Amino acid sequence: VVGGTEAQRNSWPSQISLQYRSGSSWAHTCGGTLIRQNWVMTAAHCVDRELTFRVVVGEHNLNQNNGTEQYVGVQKIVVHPYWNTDDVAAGYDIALLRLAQSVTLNSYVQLGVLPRAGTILANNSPCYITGWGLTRTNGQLAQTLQQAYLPTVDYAICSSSSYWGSTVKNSMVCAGGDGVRSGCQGDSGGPLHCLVNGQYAVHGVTSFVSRLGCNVTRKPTVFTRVSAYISWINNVIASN
Numbered sequence: 001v002v003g004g005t006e007a008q009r010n011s012w013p014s015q016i017s018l019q020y021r022s023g024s025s026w027a028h029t030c031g032g033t034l035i036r037q038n039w040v041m042t043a044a045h046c047v048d049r050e051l052t053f054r055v056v057v058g059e060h061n062l063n064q065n066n067g068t069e070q071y072v073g074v075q076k077i078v079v080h081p082y083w084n085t086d087d088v089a090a091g092y093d094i095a096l097l098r099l100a101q102s103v104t105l106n107s108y109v110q111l112g113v114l115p116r117a118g119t120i121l122a123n124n125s126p127c128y129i130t131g132w133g134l135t136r137t138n139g140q141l142a143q144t145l146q147q148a149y150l151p152t153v154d155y156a157i158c159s160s161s162s163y164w165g166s167t168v169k170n171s172m173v174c175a176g177g178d179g180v181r182s183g184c185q186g187d188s189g190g191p192l193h194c195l196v197n198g199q200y201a202v203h204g205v206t207s208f209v210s211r212l213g214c215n216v217t218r219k220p221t222v223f224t225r226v227s228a229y230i231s232w233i234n235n236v237i238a239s240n
């Protein structure tokens with residue numbers, strides 16, 4: 001997250017860190033949202049590589065013991081049938097990970113609330129992006145969970161010429177674009193939390209930023225629109 005502030009430990013308890021086995025250690029590669037005690041929602045592009053993945057819930061500082069972490073293996077990966085690695089602009093950048101065990105919920109580990117199917121946010125809706133991604137374009141990962149206030153940019157504005165044009169689809173949410181705050185590499189797969197009727201719900205899965213940089217004016221961070229995939233999410237969990 002570029003232009004973020006450090007999150008309080010208990011603010012975003014559905015946030016997970018998706019990590020892959022790297023030599024003798026584990027390395028953070030993406031965020032995700034815990035949606036059931038044994039299911040995580042993330043971006044399909046985070047699991048394109050055939051790596052050994054694990055999920056950490058109750059995580060705050062990647063590099064220090066917090067006393068709250070639970071570590072669990074990924075047993076099954078279900079990417080969207082229509083995801084195409086060579087075409088992120090087509091959308092469908094979403095995957096569901098079934099965990100090897102059910103995690104224990106507490107004030108640090110909670111399920112993410114999903115929006116009702118088809119819900120579209122009004123322009124400039126209040127949302128926050130969270131993650132341990134790069135804190136500068138071509139920088140390094142954050143140690144502690146960052147958050148940035150990223151208001152939505154509705155589809156009509158975001159698909160105009162001066163913003164993303166034809167690259168953004170109506171199956172996506174745009175947020176930010178002020179040149180100062182944004183998602184960045186390593187935030188991919190994570191939540192966009194938006195306040196709706198007094199409750200935060202996860203309306204986006206972080207998908208992509210500009211090839212030119214993370215925080216680029218009029219190139220808002222682009223998210224998979226979760227409310228476009230509620231039937232698919234529920235059909236996958238009910239059979240696995």
Ligand SMILES: *NC(=O)[C@H](C)NC(=O)[C@H](C)NC(=O)OC(C)(C)C
Nearest residue numbers: 028029046139140141185186187188
């Ligand atoms: N969000 C994304 O697209 C990808 C999958 N994540 C990364 O590229 C990772 C997190 N970046 C990375 O590992 O960061 C350093 C700076 C190379 C350590």
Ligand SMILES: [Ca+2]
Nearest residue numbers: 061064065066
């Ligand atoms: Ca830790």
